Amino acid sequence: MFQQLSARLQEAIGRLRGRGRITEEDLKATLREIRRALMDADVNLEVARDFVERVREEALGKQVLESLTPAEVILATVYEALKEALGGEARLPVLKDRNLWFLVGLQGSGKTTTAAKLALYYKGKGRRPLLVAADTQRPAAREQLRLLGEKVGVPVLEVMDGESPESIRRRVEEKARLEARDLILVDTAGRLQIDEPLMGELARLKEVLGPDEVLLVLDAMTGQEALSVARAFDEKVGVTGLVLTKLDGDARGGAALSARHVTGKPIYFAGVSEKPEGLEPFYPERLAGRILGM
Numbered sequence: 001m002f003q004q005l006s007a008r009l010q011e012a013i014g015r016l017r018g019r020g021r022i023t024e025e026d027l028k029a030t031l032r033e034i035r036r037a038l039m040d041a042d043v044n045l046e047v048a049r050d051f052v053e054r055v056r057e058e059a060l061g062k063q064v065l066e067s068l069t070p071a072e073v074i075l076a077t078v079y080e081a082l083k084e085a086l087g088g089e090a091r092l093p094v095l096k097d098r099n100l101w102f103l104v105g106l107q108g109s110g111k112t113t114t115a116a117k118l119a120l121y122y123k124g125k126g127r128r129p130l131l132v133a134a135d136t137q138r139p140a141a142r143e144q145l146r147l148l149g150e151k152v153g154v155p156v157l158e159v160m161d162g163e164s165p166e167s168i169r170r171r172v173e174e175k176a177r178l179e180a181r182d183l184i185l186v187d188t189a190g191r192l193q194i195d196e197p198l199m200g201e202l203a204r205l206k207e208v209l210g211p212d213e214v215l216l217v218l219d220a221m222t223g224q225e226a227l228s229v230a231r232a233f234d235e236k237v238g239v240t241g242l243v244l245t246k247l248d249g250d251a252r253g254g255a256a257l258s259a260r261h262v263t264g265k266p267i268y269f270a271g272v273s274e275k276p277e278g279l280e281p282f283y284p285e286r287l288a289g290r291i292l293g294m
């Protein structure tokens, strides 16, 4: 997945095993390599510096200098940092009796796609999802989700042009009632850049609908930019969880490894393909070990 950084963090570590015992000087050289790999992987400079410093201390604490095989100690420490950096323990939205989630993000984020992926994912977990195209301005946008739902066998309610939040709430509540939906997914309008008027309307909707979760969908290939947007969305509307899409095309992994510190939000899911099935719960442990070959 993160082959680039992987192969990179590999030479750095693999450059210590066959040596047999290592000196602090050699350790600093390795850490610099590691630190450079992270920066080159678009990892928030701050996160990258902290990472290597953490590895340094942890490494010394593990008596690395006093080891017949340091390359391994450095491996365990670096794996621990990646794991923590990625989020630590795996998390997932907690489902209740009835759930109503919002999907937010900018255009080309994978938002709408992820919307169907969630409906399909939870449809196979014994849920009855309802997809809703919340874009009140563009009919072509609601149309893209109407098709997707038709593809994953999940009903879709499309709001009207300029429909009010209350009207949308009434309509959505009634459908869920008559069709027995327990998971209600609201795909909100996707725009190129942050649109203040839209945020206002999303805030009002958030107020009228009262979503249990507000998932912001970010395209992982946009690097650190996805984090500045995540902050914007959190400050302007309010985020509860993240979804990293296009991770299969993500050669660096800067956004993934920086979301924790930068946004302080948990990454619930990871997009791994353009197909409705291309979704899976975010597993920090998995990726951490994967990046190192563990």
Ligand SMILES: Nc1nc2c(ncn2[C@@H]2O[C@H](COP(=O)(O)OP(=O)(O)NP(=O)(O)O)[C@@H](O)[C@H]2O)c(=O)[nH]1
Pocket: 106, 107, 108, 109, 110, 111, 112, 113, 114, 141, 144, 189, 190, 191, 245, 246, 247, 248, 249, 270, 271, 272, 273, 274, 275, 278
């Ligand atoms: N490789 C890959 N492509 C993805 C993934 N998720 C979505 N895509 C692709 O990215 C493109 C944009 O997705 P999407 O955001 O749903 O399209 P949009 O019309 O901009 N809708 P929105 O308003 O929600 O942003 C689509 O061509 C979709 O197939 C993923 O996990 N991996």
